[PDB]
């Protein structure tokens, strides 16, 4: 008649389904929406913050030997996904010379960070030119305008880049209701979440759960 | 598109012409002889309404200065593939058929009665024999700007004119995308625009670069094209060119090699494709207001680049000549920390 | 309004001294308009706390 | 709403002063430099310094008195000056790139001036007529219509006792009804029998159930209405009698006018704000959209069109006989096609049900008319010509089905002519307004009362030879706010309206009840004041709702009121000329 | 019927054929 | 030379022309140098957008991605349009364009095993089989008819999840982002082409509290570039008179436009805690006097 | 007999009109008191207490005009008419 | 990230309340408000009446003899009665009176455990030589349940199920207000509003709702270990 809920996991390649029931009538929708809202904006992550291109003073220019200018490579690099273990700005390197193609797998990350999608295409180089790019990896949550580095007053060789710390990509839920006249009137929530492979769905779900628990703890205290 | 429209513009005022106050109001209205020569839709919204038209798609100026319009003459009720150009006077003196009227594959008029345009403001069915001339295409009266508005046969005249005028005010974005739905007059309007380079002779590309390209002609003559990158446009926007060709491809003559502003694979692209929803939402979209998801902001979907321009000059004076110098009286070192030696 | 020269001459001949009455002239000069909160009936008001408040203020 | 980047640069001296007061800087120059650098120590002072500092907004070009309001500022991000939906009509602004300036009073006198007189909440009533202008205008009206609409045979409606089963559809209080609706067993718009406790019943039930003893909070009575109506009435100010009718725009206007004529301005503004919020909340869920399946073609238009075309061919043959001339042919064609368009419009109206979004929008008075719907679904009909005469060639298709090249070419003329007409009308109205303002600059109420006796007599309402009384169709304008010159004593010795008492809606109703027809009313045309006009003659003000106060300019108000409607004045001509 | 050599392919709701290409704009 | 009021961004290039290097220059000049400043603008509030059917608008608000309504499969929408403006303006074409865009984007496959449906008789034989993100083109005055759209919308390829989102009519079931519960009725969705107009917001926004004053007219400069105040039309004077507001008009005409000593004193009083002193004699009146006294017309004051 | 308002509209306008003869007089009748209050604040450091400070206890850094309007609603001021 | 703590303020009235939470991260306003309102409205357990009986009437079409009120009016009056029970099983209750006069909730004899928190409530009035006997059952539950869900219930003579209210709170409303903690000037300020019955205080109802919601999200938290701000 009255039992506490329980959460179980149904697994797939990269997107997992979570089933929660039994819930009281007219209550699954709100819980699912709250979880979705807290999942898509308050999951900590790490992403590139600012780059440093040797032999280039700003972003509105080109570099000999490449097929696309600086703006295109910045746009391509925005797709890069990295996970930070240290809580301080770390530095990576990207040195590729000669004809061929330069991909995400040519970066030499330091200790405590990794690149999980080596198949991305950054750009291509003609034999004439070379390339050496240094980039930073800071840890934040949400979304921050690139201009943050403008006020730091660094040297000319620094180019700000927009940071987007979010491993979650899409979330959806459907409720399976049971509106029989019996006291078994409940609903079954079916929540599905997919991540950018930076973290498995379980970690993100646990982080969101902890965030909401800490937020709602302020009400349980006797007033 | 704006440049092409300006080059195709038809002014009616200025030196040697009537003024705004003396010009009659009737001249600003349409005339049954405008069909095929001047578009009736495209027009400035301001007070200069009706004094600034635009050539039709197929309009060509005769050597004297009387606009013409192509037509195929029906000899004995059979359409003729060969076409001729007729002026206003000759057009009035003949019978012009309707392009949309069904016609059999053999050139036989299936309908005995076909609508027709007559001397002036007269339309009436006539036997399918006396008809003499037939139009070429249904799009023979629209302008270049108006010719690329899908489902133009469903909107209103004022709305169509407003959309046509709006199309000439887009801003080049950073990452353009070709429209999913659009007329077939997009690539042609881009090749003739001049803002996209094109190979002259069918050759094979040896190497390409972000700043220049080198194509090898089949006759053994090497040629190089230089593409301006990030040069301020005449109206403050940016202009760039990104080659869309690979190394080691035998590019045929007439094939686009680079895409200029508002282009995607050699075709016009003035905007992006967004998923729209039609419903009033908490009054935030009240009275023509609009709501946008932050995904567009955080993904540079509608991010543009604008380039300013400033200039200073040091001109001689009777009291002396001014000279640009790093030093300046009574200024802290921090203020001039950016100026160089010169 | 109109024909400034003629009316100016006519007024000067008669030495027509006119009080700052109406709005247009009074706004051209810049002085407070004689309307709304500008009429002398309200521009000269003296307000002080009632004696009861002062006795019981402290 | 004001962007912070603008407010901070607009309150610079006040911020600097308050900041140097708080010892965040040492001098004035350092404070100015820090404000220039925009350190995070400035935002708190900026928020503290604009607590009750009014600002002045002005949409360019201002036209009438209500074109310059005085709103309280509020910090918000972005680079756009936020605004309230209900004041856009005052400026006649459209949220599509319009720009307005923002001024700011400095001295302590201008602050009080803009806080008392120019405040927005004290100018609900337009100066043209003593009736409110800031009312649900466009979208929220649809939401209110949907909320107050009634439907039969819904889920959870009231039912009678059927033998062994009780009568279901009765709720103890609105809270239980709300909970039931939330659960999903009661549609928001259905017939219910709720038991209200904090809503005065209608007079017809108030005088019967309680025997006129007087309703007070805590008295229960069994109502018969729909939950939507109760939820709507909960927004109205307490004590107002229950309203239990569908809310068409006319009903909305009547209710708002009654509230303005029976309650103070502040209560009216508060209830209007609450009603706007409720309408915005409930408009989204009304399910009003647009799709191909919504614009439905008529079922039997083809037969009617064929018959009318056959008659057109008949008259065409008649002309071919040569008896008639071109003019008669044109007249016959135009009248035939007008009749055909009317018949097709009638058929199209008979076809659509009461569920299509177009019908719901048009019938609820939200916007538009039936002619636009007919053009969009039925027939566009004959169209104007550059000479103004109707072309003998009518269009036989609607925009939904798709026009042809010839029809569009013929149609362009109307749009061109309308554009030209608007272009000339704007300037004509502007010039007329300027002249009218010029002529009457120096009219001001000087004396409180000229104690004159000449009062123009106006026929209030005529008494029909067969009927008992017919209200004059223009009593709303001639004698609605004028001060009653002499008491309109009824046939007997009792006095229904006493001398000097200003007229109004309740007093007009009382006079109508007394059957009085001819009334002598005090008017300003016969004011005996040497300069300007005495306040008594002028009568009840427009924006104040009471007698005009001494010193208030009336000439400017009259000029603005008469000149504002000049924009819509179009064609011995009958238009603005 | 793509006159230009390598334009993108986009089939159209074509029902009638125009007997002449658009002249040089 | 300094950057004007309301500009920022990188410096991409500097061009300098010197007469020493034998560079043609306008007569009487020696060194003309021009600097280009390039700024990247992201679409923000107060920006114009409009489709190809002439439906302008402004960005009322940019909600977070987590708040917008989302399809049944979790695909949040990118823009929401009002509905009351469609039938009044009578631009129904955009609805058909949106439907066709959705159909082309989702890809379709019209059934042909039993034969071409009557509504698909005139469709080109190569247009019966499309791919996701396909490209379609409808020439003006000759395009897909209503029946063509009706047929196409009934054969769209299903999502990778195996379910079809939109119905035959073209509407779909959404889920509110705030409440979290589905809307009572379906809504129309689809892909529509959106451009970007040149009437940006950064150009329009401008403020001015205190700045350079004109030397010939003693009035503040005009224009955003010059950092000047806004104009005050006479209609505003009429409005102020209408309300009966006097001191406000006095300030607007005297203490904030012309009176020099007035401006200095009021600024100092505001900087301190002292009350604002009453305005003085506007420069316009004194100029008018000293000019009319030049025509032999003795203009007295009669302070008495 | 209505919900308490918030913002600058408190106290309401109709209540004040019950005291003052006309709205045009009230603006000056309050502005002069606000001026006196500001003068008293200016001399708070040292001087004569002839311009008695606020009658009603003020809030947390409230503008003097708000104090004047809130105390006028309390009927604590007396004034003479025009001259 | 610690960020800034969010404190829950409070306001007091006769029986209403306006709880305020300030400040909150941008977007969390509704995220709290909606779920908290739903939890408060349909989570707190309570007791109420489910069915009634009247031996003096065979069905519901007519009215009980010798009583001014009608059967529907009696049902409505008895539904609003506030009953608190501590026993799970459904217990019975009897109301009996004779002669002219009125009837009050306090006059109903309560069995062990069950109690009535409003004895002065009116139910109906009797004329001379009037009588009515009622046997109403009381059950404990949560939220709201209509009588339709209790339609099929054995076989009886005059069983008349009545829509019960298994909750001590009956109305909740909330809004969101912007706030300026920094240059962000977008932080939300939840403003809750609750109006409970006499069987619970708003603050204890809110504490119970928070307890239940925290217990529910304990499942989400327990799947792994990871921390966040205050
Ligand atoms: Mg506008
Ligand atoms: Zn008089």
Author numbering:
A (entry chain a): 4 to 226
B (entry chain c): 446 to 787
C (entry chain d): 1226 to 1283
D (entry chain d): 442 to 1012, 1024 to 1029
E (entry chain c): 29 to 53
F (entry chain c): 837 to 1140
G (entry chain e): 28 to 110
H (entry chain b): 3 to 232
Give the exact sentences the study uses for this entry.
In bacteria, transcription is carried out by the RNA polymerase (RNAP) core (E) composed of five subunits (α_2_ββ’ω). To initiate transcription, the core associates with the promoter-specific initiation factor σ (the σ subunit) to form the RNAP holoenzyme (Eσ). Most Mtb genes are transcribed by RNAP harboring the principal σ^A^ subunit and the principal-like σ^B^ subunit that belong to group I and group II, respectively, and share almost identical promoter binding regions. Here, we show that the stress-response σ^B^ factor from the human pathogen, *Mycobacterium tuberculosis*, induces the RNAP holoenzyme oligomerization into a supramolecular complex composed of eight RNAP units.
Although the cryo-EM map of R1 displayed better resolved electron density for σ^B^_2_ than that of R5, in both maps the σ^B^C-terminal domain density was absent. Local resolution calculations of the R1 Eσ^B^ map showed that the central part of the Mtb RNAP core was determined at a resolution between 3.4 and 3.7 Å and displayed well defined structural elements (**[Fig fig2], Figure S4B, Figure S5**). Domain σ^B^_2_ was determined at resolution between 3.8 and 5 Å. In Eσ^B^, the β flap tip was turned 111° towards the σ^B^2 and β’ CC that is equal to its 27 Å displacement (closed flap state) ([Fig fig3]). The distance between β flap and β’ CC decreased to 46 Å ([Table tbl2]). Thus, σ^B^4 could not be correctly positioned for the −35 element promoter binding. Superposition of the Eσ^B^ structure with the published models showed that in Eσ^B^, the clamp adopted a “fully open” conformation with a rotation angle of 22° relative to σ^A^-RPo (**[Fig fig3]**) and a clamp-β lobe distance of 28 Å (**[Table tbl2]**). We concluded that the fully open clamp state observed in Eσ^B^ is characteristic of RNAP inactive state in which the σ subunit regions 3.2 and 4 are unloaded from the RNA exit channel.
